[PDB]
C-alpha cells in the first residue's frame, strides 16, 4: 500500500497473511471466507518462468494480526495448509486471467472479535456495486500496522487504454487518475465493498497486479471474484 492510513483494530477481521517458512516472511495477502477456507491470487503460488511452484508444506498463514513487528498473544492465530487449489484456467502465460486460488486449512480457525469471514457476492450485489466511480477498500502493508486505502473503480475502456496487457471479463481495475495506491506487493489481498442494502462487507476483487507505485503505470488490476464464484463453490462443496 502507498499513502494509505493505519487500520483500526478489528477493521479487517478477514485479513490473512500468507508466509513462506524459509525465509519466514510475508509472501502475499489473502482473505478468510469460512473457518477453513482462504482465498488468494494464483500467481502468489504458481509462476513457472520464475520457478515458483509452492506446495502445501512450504507455507503458513497468519490470521488476526494487526502489527507485523510484534506477536499479539491472545489475538492472532497461525495455520498450516492441508491442500492448495489453483484455478484450472489460470493463464500465467499471457495475462494472469483467472488469477485465483483456494487454500484449505488443516484445522478450522476459531472466530473472534479479530477473526471473522468476509462475504462473497451474489449476482445482485455484484450488479449493483461493481460500477465505475464506486469506491472499494484494499488492505495490505507499507508503518508497522495494517494499512488501508479506498479506491474508485475505473471505466473499462480507460483500464484497457492504460496497459498493454489484454484485459478479460474476469478482471476489473481501480485507482485514482494520475492520493493512495494498491501495489504489486499487495497481491493476493482483498478489494472489499460495503453494501448499502444490508451493511455487510463483500469481497469483489483480489489484487492481481499493480502498475503504479514503484512503476510509472496508472492503475491496479483485480480478479473479478463473482465471475469465478462457480469454481469456488465447486471446490468447497466437493
Amino acid at each position: 500500500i502507498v499513502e494509505g492510513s493505519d487500520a483500526e483494530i478489528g477493521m479487517s477481521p478477514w485479513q490473512v497473511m500468507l508466509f513462506r517458512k524459509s525465509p519466514q516472511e510475508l509472501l502475499c495477502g489473502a482473505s478468510l471466507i469460512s473457518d477453513r477456507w482462504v482465498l488468494t491470487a494464483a500467481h502468489c503460488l504458481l509462476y513457472p518462468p520464475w520457478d515458483k511452484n509452492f506446495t502445501e508444506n512450504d507455507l503458513l498463514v497468519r490470521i488476526g494480526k494487526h502489527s507485523r513487528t510484534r506477536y499479539e498473544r491472545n489475538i492472532e492465530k497461525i495455520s498450516m495448509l492441508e491442500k492448495i487449489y489453483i484455478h484450472p484456467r489460470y493463464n500465467w502465460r499471457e495475462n494472469l486471467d483467472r488469477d485465483i486460488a483456494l487454500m484449505k486449512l488443516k484445522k478450522p480457525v476459531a472466530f473472534s472479535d479479530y477473526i471473522h469471514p468476509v462475504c462473497l457476492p451474489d449476482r445482485e450485489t455484484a450488479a449493483s456495486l461493481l460500477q465505475a466511480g464506486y469506491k472499494g477498500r484494499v488492505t495490505g502493508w507499507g508503518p508497522s500496522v495494517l494499512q488501508v486505502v479506498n479506491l474508485p473503480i475505473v471505466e473499462r475502456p480507460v483500464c484497457k487504454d492504460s496497459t498493454r496487457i489484454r484485459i478479460t471479463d474476469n478482471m476489473f481495475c481501480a485507482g485514482y487518475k494520475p492520493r493512495g495506491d494498491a501495489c504489486e506487493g499487495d497481491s493476493g489481498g482483498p478489494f472489499v465493498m460495503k453494501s448499502p442494502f444490508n451493511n455487510r462487507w463483500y469481497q469483489m476483487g483480489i489484487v492481481s497486479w499493480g502498475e503504479g507505485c514503484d512503476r510509472d503505470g496508472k492503475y491496479g488490476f483485480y480478479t473479478h471474484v463473482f465471475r469465478l464464484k462457480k469454481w469456488i463453490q465447486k471446490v468447497i462443496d466437493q
Partner: peptide, 29 residues
Amino acid sequence: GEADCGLRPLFEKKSLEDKTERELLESYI
C-alpha cells in the same frame, strides 16, 4: 456463505462505523 459473514464484531455488531467507511457509501450516491 456463512450466516453472519461480512458483519464485523467491533463495528457493525456494535453499531459503530470505522473512520473512512462513509467515503465508500458516499461514492454510491
